[PDB]
């Protein structure tokens, strides 16, 4: 199974199937000849497989790293500790790559689940996706195919001087 | 370079505090490279002179062997002595002057200023 949250959906509503016409229609035969011939051996191999796991279940954990101090309070020069501080930035920029990667995972199930009216109920989804952009622009774009913690952290420092001097020339 | 300390006793292979270094292992790698060295002239001899290469003369292969070795490892003792001496020297003069190499402080990076160039 999954999250419900971090993947959302909406509650299915089915209209009711009611016969107009007196033809009756082979959806409803060809569905009872899938549950029966089709889903019935699926199901006993399911029950099958899933018995024999029963026997043997062990777990596997989830892999979880401390907070380590940053790379703005390293001694230039010495790689004993930027080494850590790189080290849990690379596995934050993996973290928020993946998080990029589930927003536009749910834009794109919101606009396939809302069918030909997807402009107006996906609105927040958007505004969501639109936020997490300019978040990821804002923190790692134009870093360069060498990207390092050094350059991240000078890239914020100048976009920082940028928003000083926008509030001092606007005060 | 260090002729001044080759300048009062000379023409001496190992010195005195030459004895008070640890003397290299006869399992170091570069004495096993020497006398693959060794092993390699003992097989040109046998090469060039039109002879069995693996097989004839035993007792030549093993001279060799053991000429290198020996060679190899008195070498092997002067470069660690010399560079011991290197070091020694080294450090007693970064002692004896400390108005002319200062300390440093290593400044964290949430305060030095470094210019970002965007790549695209």
Redesign the interface.
């Known amino acids: 199974s999954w999250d419900k949250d971090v993947y959302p959906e909406p509650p299915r509503r089915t209209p009711a199937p009611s016969p107009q016409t007196s033809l009756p229609n082979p959806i409803t035969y060809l569905t009872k000849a899938f549950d029966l011939l089709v889903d019935r051996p699926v199901t006993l191999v399911r029950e099958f497989i899933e018995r024999q796991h029963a026997k043997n279940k062990y777990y596997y954990y989830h892999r979880e790293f401390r907070r380590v101090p940053d ?8 790689v004993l500790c ?1 080494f850590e501080a790189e080290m849990q930035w690379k596995r934050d920029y993996k973290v928020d790559q993946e998080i990029v990667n589930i927003i536009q995972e749910r834009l794109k199930a919101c606009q396939q689940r809302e069918g030909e009216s997807h402009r107006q109920n996906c609105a927040k989804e958007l505004q969501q996706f639109t936020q997490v952009v300019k978040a990821y622009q804002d923190r790692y774009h ?4 060498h990207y390092s913690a ?2 991240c ?3 914020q ?2 976009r920082m001087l940028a928003e000083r001097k926008a509030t001092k020339e606007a005060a | 370079m260090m002729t001044g300390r080759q300048a009062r006793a000379p023409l001496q292979f190992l010195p005195d505090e030459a004895r008070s270094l640890p003397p290299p292992k006869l399992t170091d790698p570069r004495l096993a490279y020497i006398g693959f060295l060794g092993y390699c002239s003992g097989l040109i001899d046998n090469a060039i002179r039109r002879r069995p290469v693996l097989s004839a003369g035993l007792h030549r292969q093993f001279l060799y062997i053991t000429s290198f070795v020996f060679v190899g490892y008195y070498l092997l003792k002067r470069q660690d002595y010399m560079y011991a001496v290197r070091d020694h020297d080294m450090f007693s003069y970064i002692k004896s002057h400390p108005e002319d190499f200062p300390e440093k402080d290593k400044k964290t990076y949430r305060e030095v200023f470094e210019e970002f160039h965007p790549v695209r």
């Open positions: 790379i703005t309070e390293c001694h230039e020069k010495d930027m134009d870093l360069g195919a050094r350059k952290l000078a890239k420092k100048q």
